[PDB]
Every structure is written in structure tokens, then in C-alpha cells.
Amino acid sequence: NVLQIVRDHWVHILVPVGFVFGCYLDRRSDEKLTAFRNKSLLFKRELRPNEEVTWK
Amino acid sequence: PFFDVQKRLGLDLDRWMTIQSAEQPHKIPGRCHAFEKEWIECAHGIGGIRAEK
Amino acid sequence: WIARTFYDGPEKNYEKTMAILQIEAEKAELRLKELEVRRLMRARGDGPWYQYPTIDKALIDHSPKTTPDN
Amino acid sequence: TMMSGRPGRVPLQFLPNEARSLPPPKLTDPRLVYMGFLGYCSGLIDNAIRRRPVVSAGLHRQLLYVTSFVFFGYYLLKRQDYMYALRDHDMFAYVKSHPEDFPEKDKKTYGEILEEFHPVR
Amino acid sequence: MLKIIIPTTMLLPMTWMSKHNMIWINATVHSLLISLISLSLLNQLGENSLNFSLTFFSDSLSAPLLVLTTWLLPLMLMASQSHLSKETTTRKKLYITMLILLQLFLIMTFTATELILFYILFEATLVPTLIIITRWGNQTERLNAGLYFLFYTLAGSLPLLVALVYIQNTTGSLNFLIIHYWSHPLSNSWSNIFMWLACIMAFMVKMPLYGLHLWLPKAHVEAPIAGSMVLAAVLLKLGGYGMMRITTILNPLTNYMAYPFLMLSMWGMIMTSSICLRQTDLKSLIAYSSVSHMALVIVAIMIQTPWSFMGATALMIAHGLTSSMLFCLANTNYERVHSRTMILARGLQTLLPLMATWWLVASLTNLALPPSINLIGELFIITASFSWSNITIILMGMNMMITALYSLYMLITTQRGKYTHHINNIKPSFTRENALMALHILPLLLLTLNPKMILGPLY
Amino acid sequence: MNPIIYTTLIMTVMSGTMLVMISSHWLLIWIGFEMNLLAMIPVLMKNFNPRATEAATKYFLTQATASMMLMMAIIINLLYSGQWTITKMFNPVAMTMMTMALAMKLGLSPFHFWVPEVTQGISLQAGLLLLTWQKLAPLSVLCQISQSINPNLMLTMAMLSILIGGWGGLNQTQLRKIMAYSSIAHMGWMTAVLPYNTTMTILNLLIYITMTLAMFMLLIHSSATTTLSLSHTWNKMPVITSLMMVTLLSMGGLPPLSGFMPKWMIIQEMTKNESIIMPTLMAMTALLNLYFYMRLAYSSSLTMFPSTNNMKMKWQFEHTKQMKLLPTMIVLSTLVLPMTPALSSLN
Amino acid sequence: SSLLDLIWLETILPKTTSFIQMKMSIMVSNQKGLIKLYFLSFLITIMISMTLFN
Amino acid sequence: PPEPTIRLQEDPDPEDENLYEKNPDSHGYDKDPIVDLWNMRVVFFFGFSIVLVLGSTFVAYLPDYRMQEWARREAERLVKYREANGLPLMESNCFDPNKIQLPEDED
Amino acid sequence: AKTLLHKYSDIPEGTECHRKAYASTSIGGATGLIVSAYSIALKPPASFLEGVARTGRYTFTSAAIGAIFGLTSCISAQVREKPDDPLNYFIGGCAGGLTLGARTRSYGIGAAACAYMGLTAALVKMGQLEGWQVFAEPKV
């Protein structure tokens, strides 16, 4: 029965929500270090016609 | 530590009594007024280390 | 399929490592420079740091003192 | 470092005027979030000591705890950032004004550096 | 790396807001899910590392340790479910909180990219373990045990901190990447000798090195079952990981500073093994066997060769799994008999046959039967030691024989012979215990199929 | 005493401390110390009994001798230079006298003997005040004249204080004497870093004051002054014992608690001045403080001691007066390590 | 097992540390509480600091 | 000696409880049969079915980021080229001496 | 003061055994006198005569320890022809510990004293060689 089993099983969303938030947090960190994106001597490449960044 | 309340407010709670050459009553000079005045004017605004050297 | 839906390419990690290494090397150089600057300032006293107070010269009274020789 | 005697310093100013040229910390700063977490923990401990239902005893009291911690943490973060900015400013100015104490090292290449080799045997 | 850290943190509110009768179920399910998530760290490169951010990075040395750490938590929960039945809800939640905090501290410690950060978490792992030992331990010796486990550790690690800050005032950085790329030789000097000792002794005392190992039997025999599991499986490997990381700045001093420890290990592994031949306590025997295996790991790290490092990594993983399984078997006997003496409960193969099969497999794995990864690590270490000096084989060979002896000794005393007549309370094995043993033993035999996963960064 | 008189005396104590902290004239600093000592005596003797009177006279004699030598140092400094400003000391003999006087005011070894007896004689509130507030003025004066201290004497007294506190705490079953010896050791840690960085001294003082306030308030809440009396608290309020155990772990310098922040920082600072042996010995000796903290934790919350029947009545009653800022003190004394870089605020 | 592990390794590191720290604790804390001896010691340390550190 | 020879008022040591007595098919997880059955089910499903099988399959099919087959192909091409042109396979010098400036001893 | 330290240090390590022994004896006597003064202050045993006996015993013990250490270390450095080597100091230190153990008439203290003293003397020699500071000056 909805609105009754929720009061007992709302706990089961905490860990998956933590997982999604952790993935989102990881993505944010990546943006900060883009100082050498497409600038390394090994992977220096010319952009595609509809490409803005080589990686995200 | 030292909280310079006097300098913040411009109060002069105890600075009047710190040196010989600071506004004595009836303009009575200290025995070593000139030497103290010269030393203070030499050391002013320079810092303790440079003043000592 | 696993590589496509779970991972990125080598260049991402490569260039992130380059950026991280640059940041850390700059920080190490700055730490060494700060230690040397602190040593010089404390030894000489000619910098903004380690300034120890001297008597304010605005406290001196410049008036005739009932005696000609001060 | 001892910047207590730094020239042009107001005796009892928490944040000088020149501190306003620096970017303020964001409201989603991780340190601000940690300060709010500290306030929440203080509220929970206050509930536990007074023998009240820990999670849901006083919502107004817990909210005040978190808000006070966040407020003080924001101002503390501003002052800390300003102090580190002053440190770096003085360091760079001193290095600029004393070029003979910080010479440019003649760059050398590993192909012309003789480093001793120690075999692992 | 936060995709693993954040759910582990979310375990705490999930535990505390759970129903009184649903703490174990929720904790076990979500710990298993976190282990499944952490399985993705195994995809490593032959290049530098998985440098996620400025704070955390992963390697093929760190990834298997992280996977083992995340996998051990559900097993510890299952093992603790039994003896904590008559405990209040709040104290059970506190126990689970201690386990979660230990897992969080370990996770961060393995992936930390800074030596100081590593030191802080490496010490933070002490508080939950000390609380677990001295609060939920059974006998009165636990207090003394806790004291030992603390002070030994601290006596080693306070100098390290000093050395660490000293290093950061000289090189300018404690980041491991910069430290590796900017390494410089250590000249033979008294100051350098004492810096070497400060950097080494903290990790030596936690392996533990022979002669500094007195805390381990006390702590392991006095701890509850989950504490014994985490102490034998993960906390011992912290010293090995630390020595593997820190030896990059200690060369070429290690060429001659390693002699006192190598001897202390090569002879020590004999002594402890022989100690296992005359032991009246199961947990004490298992702890001393752990000491012998870790002495072999110490030799591997001090030799400082690629085969040595591969063998040390493989042996660390294998010993973690095997010792955890052996402690669980001993505890499953203890909860029936309440004695912890080997010769009291006898002839148990007749009364519990499947548990006897579990005992046999665990003894075979501890005996390093090929092609187990225990033998893979042992053989790689032995080959590297033989290259170091051909005489070492003698000691190594002796250890092998002795090990088999005591392993089979433990199997024969408890499982074979005639049952004890007056012991009439030996109930059939529960599904929980059988599942615990199966979840210990299946990963080992699975890992023997892909050994490259546990061979470290020098593979 | 009358609450109005008590409030006036407390305000006079704080005003003497603030007069020491804000003045630039040596005579005014001496006057602030005199005012603080004058107002401090009734606070110690608030609950009249022979023990409190004895503690008050011991404290008076010690502080009066220290103030007399402070005046002597001021006069010698004035003799060799017509200066009244608190700055460089201008004379080695005067500076040695000033250092010794301030050391006896603080209770550093070898002038540590009065601290355990005074703390044992007085109540817990007076002990809280004596061990927290009565350290601000001498430490501020020491910070102002740090550039003139002879480092040998300061470091000798600091190391002696750490050793004496560690050794004397091992033998104690009275909680107030345990606090006194802990205070002596923490004072040694604070003064071992004055020659190199006064910011580290202030940070250590703040952390120590927070931890001491938390522990004293926890001891007042569970009105216990002995180990065995504290061993009964779990049967009435186990939450208090658990909080006290975590606070004791923090006071032992164990990471990742707050009490690790000072030693760490101090060690780092000392290493920056090519000082290696002394921080090593200091950490080795702090291990003793940690040991007797752990013994208290064993007797208090990690095990359950026997109780008494009359405890059942106590189950039916609640504390009438609740101390504010206790939860904040506990949190600040346990969980502020991640905020360590805030020390640049020159706290 | 007995001679080395249970006796001499125990004798060397932990037991010696415990014995020395306990003896030092008894030495330091065993004071009668008489201000006589305390202030005599204060006089001695004052003289030592006057005639040793300068 | 009228002492009771009792040191204090203490509960007797309770006897251990058999889970099979009140509930055959006990599974050893909990004294509540329903909670016990569901604990068994969740442990078995999330340990054997999910982690042990799917995780093992995931690890088995991990893509070659260690670049073993890439190294094999590169070595094959190098060996082909060097055998074709008579070059002596691997060279003793890792870096060509043209770019190393040794120090003159002049001893 | 540091006068006694200067008198001991100004002598070269491998020469003037008598002078080194005399300087070490003086340093030991001063340390014993200081310890005697502290012990008399904190613990007045029974009377003036017992106090002077205790003072004499402590001073003689400390002076003998110092003398034995100095003589043994200087002789070892001279006959081994390897000055600036911490083993000579270690040997001297062990001898001092043994001298103390014999004075107290117990093997455990002598054995314990010899090992610890030998270590301390070797450490002091290493610190002299490498320039370790116990009381560091405020450099930064």
C-alpha cells in the first residue's frame, strides 16, 4: 500500500542517491583540470567540424 | 594578545607616561631628553630588528 | 560495450594527469620560495613581515623646556 | 611570517577594505557545507543531552544552529582567503624587490646531467 | 572516487533510520551493492594511474585492496549477526557504525594521493578498531589487548609524521606523483639513516615484523569475530601498501639498511611457524600463521624487484581471504562450544561434514596448494629471493614444510578422530555460516583464473 | 555569596585580564594582574570549607610572589633603559626574571606544584575558570615579548612541563588532579612554540580551552570528582559517557579528532626551524597523557562497572539546569580538523 | 614460544617501558604538599636559571 | 561469619538459545521466521547472483586498457621491419648517444 | 654553565686522556650536586648528617660515571686510530652504565644502564658529527 510502505522503505533510496550524487561530484572535478585538454603533445588533434571539446 | 584598543579609538589611555620626552607638566625636561628624542626619531617606522642594528 | 558505456578514452586521463602534475609542481615551488622569503625577512627585517614596534615619534614634545639645553 | 606589525593595518578590523577586491566564497562552498554539518551535529547533540527525540525534537533550534554556523563560517572563510592573499602578495613583492637573492637558475637538460646509477641486485 | 565514498557515507543514516528488525538486511544489501560498484576500479592501465582528482587516485596496487575492503564488510555483518542477538538496537547500530567508519577510513587511505592525508586516515583507522575490540570483546584481557594494539602502533607512527613534515620542507611536496617523478638518491649519512628508520618503522610495526609482533596475538584472540576478520584481512596490508609506496625515496640506502629486517623476517618466519606447531588456541595459531605470511611479504618488499612486488601483492590478497575464512571457521566452532581450545571439540567431520569440507579447502589454501594465488605469490617471492641469494631457498624451503605440517595439524585435531562424548550441543550448521564460507572461498578460486588482477602495477 | 557580588567579581576578573591585554604600559599590565588576583580569590573560596581556604592561600602566595618578581623585572628594565612600553626587554637579567615570573603565573615546570593542589581544593566551576581563563594574560604577555625570550630557557621549561604532566597524570584517581596535570602538559606544548610562531601558540590555546571547557562541563553535568564516581554515570546517562569518551580520545591527540591539530601544526613549525629531536620527544611524551586518558575511558564508557540500588531513584529525575554551549563545545573539540587552514585568520 | 615470545620479547619493549614510566610517575607525584619544599625548590631553580642560561 | 558469601546482586548467566527449537528451517539469520527467510533470500541473491556471477563476467570482459595486444602488434611490425632491412633487432642503447653530452674527464 | 662544556670539548678527541677524564669528572660532579640539591629540597630524609651523606653519595656516583665514560671513550678512540667514530662513545657509554650498575650492586640496572648509555653517547657523537641541534634557533 502506497503512502504506508513508504514510511518503512524510504531508507532504501539513500545509498543509490548517494551513488548518483557521487558520480555527479566526480564530473564537476573533471571540469577544473581541463587546462591541457587537446594540448598534450601525444593527443594534439584538430577539431571535427561539429566538435567543441575533445573529451568531457 | 595585544588588542590595540587605544590606537583603534585614538584614546591615549597610557601612552602619555611611556617615555621621558612626552609632554611633562610645566614643560619640565627629563635628564636625557635629547638622547631619547634622537633615538626615537632614528628608530621610528623602521622595525625592531633594523632599529637595533 | 563495456568501454562505450562505462569508460572514457586514454586522452582524458592523460591530460587530467598533466593538469594535476602542473598544479602540484607549482605548489611545491611556491612552498620552497615562501620558506626562503620567510628566512630572509626574519634575518634582515627589511620586509613587510616580522615588523616589531618601536616608539612612535609623535609622542615627543617639541617645546621650550624651562631650560635652554632641553 | 608574523604579519602583526605589517604597515597600514587597522588594530581591530576583521576584514579590511582592501579585502573587498577578492572574490567572495560561493554559498555552495564545501567548507560552508561542512560548517553547516557541524551546526547540524551540534543540534543533534543538544537534542541527545536534553533527552529529546534526537532527529525531530526541535526544528527551529536545529535550523538556528545550522544558520549560525553557516553565517560565522562564511565570514571566517572570507578572512582566511584575505590572509592567504596578503601572504602571497608580500612574497611576490619581496621576490621582485630582491632579484639578487632569487637568481634565475640556468636550465639544464637531463641529456647533459650526469646522475649516478645504483643497480638493484 | 566519490561514487564509492558517498554511498559508504550514506550507509550511516540508512543504518540509523532503519527499523529495529531490518538493520542487518539493509546493511548487507547496500554493502554488496557498494562492492559491485567498486568492482569497476579493476580496469587499470599499463600507464601511470587513474588520477581522478587532486585528492584521490587509484592504481593496480590500490584497486584489489579496495575491492577486498568493500567485499569484507557484508561478510563481517553476516558473521556478527549471530553473537549480537541479545544486544539493544542502539548498540547494534553503533557496532554497524563502527564497521562503516572503518570501511570509509580504509577506502580513503588506499586512494589518497598525499602522504600526509594517507597518514591521517592510516591513523584514523585505529579508533573504530580499538572501540570494537575493547567494547564488544568477550574476555577481560581485551582491555590490555587494546592498549597494546594502540601504543605499539603509535610508537611507530609518531616518528613517521616528523619525517613526513621534514620531507615536505625539503622537497616542497608530499604528493606521490611529484615525489616519484622528482626522486633523488639518499646519501649514506647518519641523518639519512634515521630518516630511513623513521619512514620504515611505522609500516614495519603493523605488518607486523618479527620481534614487534607481540600486539597481534593479543588483539586477534581478544577481538570479536568481525574485528578479527578486518584486522587479519585489511589492517595488516596497510603496512605493506605504505612500504611499497614509500620505498621510492629511500634508495640506495635500502641496499644495506634492509639487512637487519630481512634476517629478522627470514629467521622469524621459521620461529612463528614452529610456534604454530605447539599452540592450544585456534585463534592464536591462525594469528601466528598470519605473522609468518607477513614476514614473507616483508622480505618481498625489501628485495625491491618486479617479481618481489608482484608476489607481495598476490600474497597480500590471498592471505587476507584465507585468514578471514579461517577465523570465521574457528568462530563457528566457538559459538557452539564456548571454549576456543583446539582439543576440546574433536571429530567434527562426523557431526558436521560440509563444515569439514570448508575446513579442508581453507587448510589447503593456507597450505599454498597450486594453482592457488597463495602459491603464486609465495613462488614469485621465493624466485626473487633466490635471485637475491641462492642460500635463501633453505629457509624458504623449511618454512614451506613447516606450514603444511601445522595446517594439517589444525585440520586433524579438530575434524578427525573420535567425537568428544560429553559435548552434546553441536547443532547442524546454519545456512548463514555455510554461505559465509562459500562467499569467502569462491572469490579465491575465481581469482586464480585471472591472476593479472592481483599482481600489482609491475605486471 | 550574593549573585550580584559574584557577577561583579567575575566581571572584575575579566576586566583585569582585558586590561593586561589592551595596555601598552608595563605599570598598567602589572595593575591588571593585581586586579585579576584580587578578584580571583573569592571565586575560589565561594563554597567555604578548609580545603577551599587552603587552596586560596596557596594560590595567593604563588601569584603574589610572581607579581613581585614581575615588578622587579619591570624596574630593572626601566633602569637599563628609560622605557615603560611592552616591547623588546633590553636586558637579559630582567628578561630572565620576567620569564620566570610568567612561568610561575602559568604554572609551567618547575613552578607546577601549586596547580594540582589548587585544582583539587576548589570546586569544578572554579577549576574550570582557573584552568581556562587564567591563562590568557600571561600567554598574551609572553607573545608580546617573544622576540626577546632566550629559547634555551623557554624550551627547557616547556619540555619539563610536558614530561612532568605526563608522569604526574599516571598516578591520579582524582579527576581534578588529572585535569591539572593535563593542563601542565598542554601549557608545555603551547610554550614550546612561542620562540618560532605565536600564531601556533594561540591556536593551541584555543583548541585546549575548547576541550577543557567541554570536559569540565561534562564533569559538572555528571557530578563526579573521582574515577569510581564517574564509573556510575553509564547507569544514569550513557550518552554523557560516550560523549566524554570521544572528547577524551580527542584530548589525547588522536586523529582525525580536533586535538591532533595543534601538535601536528606545532611539529611542522618546529621542523621548519631545523628542530627535529625536540618534537619527537614531545610526541613520545604526549603518549603518557594519551595512556591515562585511555584508562579513564576504560573505566567510564568502554566497560560497565557495578552500580548501587539507590541509583534507581535517580532514574526518575532530570537535570533542572542545562548548560548552554556544551554541544557546541563538544562538536568544536571533536570535529574541526577539516577546517585546519582557517588558522591563517591569526586566531 | 616461551623463552623468546612470551618472556624476552615481552621483557624488552613493553614491560621495561611500563616499569620505567610507573617508577617515574611514583617519583614525580609522591609529594607531601608542603610549600616549604616547593618554595625551596623554586629558589634552587631560580638560582640555576640565573647562573646557567647566561 | 554471618556474611551471605554473595558479592552483589547479579543476574545468573543465561543459557544459550537454540534457533532450531522454536523454528525448524531456521536458516540461522534471525529469530523472526519471516525476517530470517528474507535475510537469507537477499544475502543469496545479492551475493551469489549479482556480485559473484555478474561481477565476475564484467571482470572477464574488461576491455584491454593495459594494451597487451597493442604491444604485440607493435612488436610484430618492428620485428618485420628490422628483419627485412637487416637491422639487429633490439638495440643495446635505449637512447641514441647523439643527444647525450658526456662530461670530459681529461684525467 | 657552558664553561665545563668548553673545557671538555676544547680537547681533541684522541689525545689528553687525563684532561678529558678530569673534565668529564667535573661535569658528572656538577650534575650530581644539582640532583642532590633537588633531592634534599624535595625530600628532607631525617637530618643534616643524612643529607650530607646522600649528597656525597650522589655526587661521587655521578662523578665516577663521568670519569669512567671519559677515560674509556678517549682510550678507545686513541687505540682504534679512528676518531670521529660513534662506536668509541658507545663503548664509553656502556662502560659508564656498567660503572653505575656496579655502584648500585645489581645486574639488571648495570645491563640496562650499559645498553641505554651506550646508545645515548653514540647519538651525541652522531649529533656532533652531523650538526644536529637540540635547541634550535628561530631561523624562519
Ligand SMILES: CCCCCCCCCCCCCCCCCC(=O)OC[C@H](COP(=O)([O-])OCC(O)COP(=O)([O-])OC[C@@H](COC(=O)CCCCCCCCCCCCCCCCC)OC(=O)CCCCCCCCCCCCCCCCC)OC(=O)CCCCCCCCCCCCCCCCC
Ligand atoms: C569521516 C567521518 C564521516 C561520518 C561522521 C561521523 C560523525 C557524524 C555525527 C556526529 C554526531 C552527531 C549525531 C550524534 C548525536 C548523538 C545522539 C545518539 O546517541 O543517537 C541516538 C539516535 C537514535 O536513538 P533515539 O531513538 O533517537 O534516542 C535514544 C537516545 O538518544 C539515547 O539512546 P540510549 O541512551 O538508549 O543508548 C545509549 C548509547 C547512546 O550513546 C551514543 O550513541 C552517543 C553517540 C556517540 C558520541 C558522539 C561523539 C560526537 C561526535 C564525534 C564523532 C567522531 C568521528 C571520528 C571518527 C572516530 C569514530 C569513533 O550509549 C551506549 O550504549 C554506551 C556504549 C558506547 C558504545 C561505544 C561508543 C562509541 C562512540 C563513537 C561514535 C562515533 C560515530 C557516531 C555516529 C552517529 C551516532 C548516533 O541516533 C540517530 O538516529 C541520529 C543519528 C544521525 C541522524 C541522521 C538523520 C539524517 C538523514 C536524512 C537524509 C540523509 C542525509 C543526506 C542528504 C541527502 C538525501 C536526499
Ligand SMILES: CCCCCCCCCCCCCCCCC[C@@H](O)O[C@H](CO[C@H](O)CCCCCCCCCCCCCCC)COP(=O)(O)OCC[N+](C)(C)C
Ligand atoms: C551479455 C552480458 C555479459 C556482461 C555482463 C556485465 C554485467 C555488468 C554489471 C557490473 C557493473 C560494474 C560496476 C560499474 C559501476 C561504476 C561505473 C560508473 O562510472 O558508470 C556509471 C553508470 O552506472 C551504472 O548504471 C551502475 C550499474 C550498477 C547496477 C548493477 C545492475 C544489477 C544490480 C541489482 C539491483 C537490485 C535489483 C532489484 C532487487 C529487488 C556512469 O558513470 P559516468 O561517470 O557517467 O561514466 C563516464 C563514461 N561515460 C561517458 C561512458 C558515461
Ligand SMILES: CCCCCCCCCCCCCCCCC[C@@H](O)O[C@H](CO[C@H](O)CCCCCCCCCCCCCCC)COP(=O)(O)OCC[N+](C)(C)C
Ligand atoms: C626489538 C625487535 C626488533 C625491532 C626492529 C629492529 C630493526 C632496527 C635495526 C637498526 C638498523 C641498523 C642501524 C644503523 C645501520 C648503519 C650501519 C652501521 O651501523 O654499521 C657500521 C657503523 O659502525 C658502528 O655501528 C657505529 C655505531 C655504533 C653505535 C650504535 C649502537 C649499536 C647497537 C645498538 C642496537 C640497539 C637497537 C634498539 C634500540 C632501543 C658501519 O661503519 P661506518 O662506515 O663507520 O658507518 C657507516 C654509516 N655512515 C656512512 C653514516 C658513517
Ligand SMILES: CCCCCCCCCCCCCCCCC[C@@H](O)O[C@H](CO[C@H](O)CCCCCCCCCCCCCCC)COP(=O)(O)OCC[N+](C)(C)C
Ligand atoms: C575550536 C576552534 C576555536 C573556536 C574559537 C571560538 C569560536 C567563537 C568565537 C566567535 C568569533 C570571534 C571573533 C571576534 C569578532 C571580530 C574580531 C576582530 O575584531 O579581531 C581581529 C582578530 O580576529 C580573530 O583573531 C579571528 C578569530 C577566528 C578564530 C577561527 C580560527 C580557528 C582555527 C581553525 C579551526 C577551525 C574552527 C572553525 C569552527 C569554529 C583582529 O585582530 P587584531 O587585533 O588585529 O590582532 C590581535 C590578534 N593577534 C595578536 C593574534 C594578531
Ligand SMILES: CCCCCCCCCCCCCCCCC[C@@H](O)O[C@H](CO[C@H](O)CCCCCCCCCCCCCCC)COP(=O)(O)OCC[N+](C)(C)C
Ligand atoms: C560443483 C560440480 C561441478 C559443476 C560445474 C561444472 C563446470 C566446470 C567449470 C568451472 C571451472 C572450470 C574452468 C573453465 C574456465 C572457463 C572460463 C575462463 O576461460 O574465463 C576466465 C575469466 O575469469 C574471470 O576473468 C575471473 C573471475 C573474476 C574474479 C572477481 C571476483 C568477483 C567479485 C567478488 C569480490 C572480490 C573479493 C576478492 C578481492 C580481490 C579467463 O578468461 P580469459 O581467457 O582471460 O578471457 C575471457 C574472454 N575474453 C578474451 C573475451 C576477454
Ligand SMILES: CCCCCCCC/C=C\CCCCCCCC(=O)O[C@H](COC(=O)CCCCCCC/C=C/CCCCCCCC)COP(=O)(O)OCCN
Ligand atoms: C615500535 C617502536 C619503534 C619506535 C620508532 C623507531 C624509529 C626511530 C627513528 C628515529 C626517530 C627520529 C626520526 C627523525 C625524523 C626524520 C627527520 C630527519 O631525518 O632529519 C635528520 C635529523 O635526524 C635526527 O636528528 C635523529 C636523531 C635521533 C633522535 C631521537 C632518537 C630516537 C631513538 C633512536 C634509536 C632508535 C632507532 C631505531 C629503533 C628500532 C626499533 C626499536 C637531519 O636533521 P638536520 O639537522 O636538519 O640535517 C643534518 C644536516 N644539518
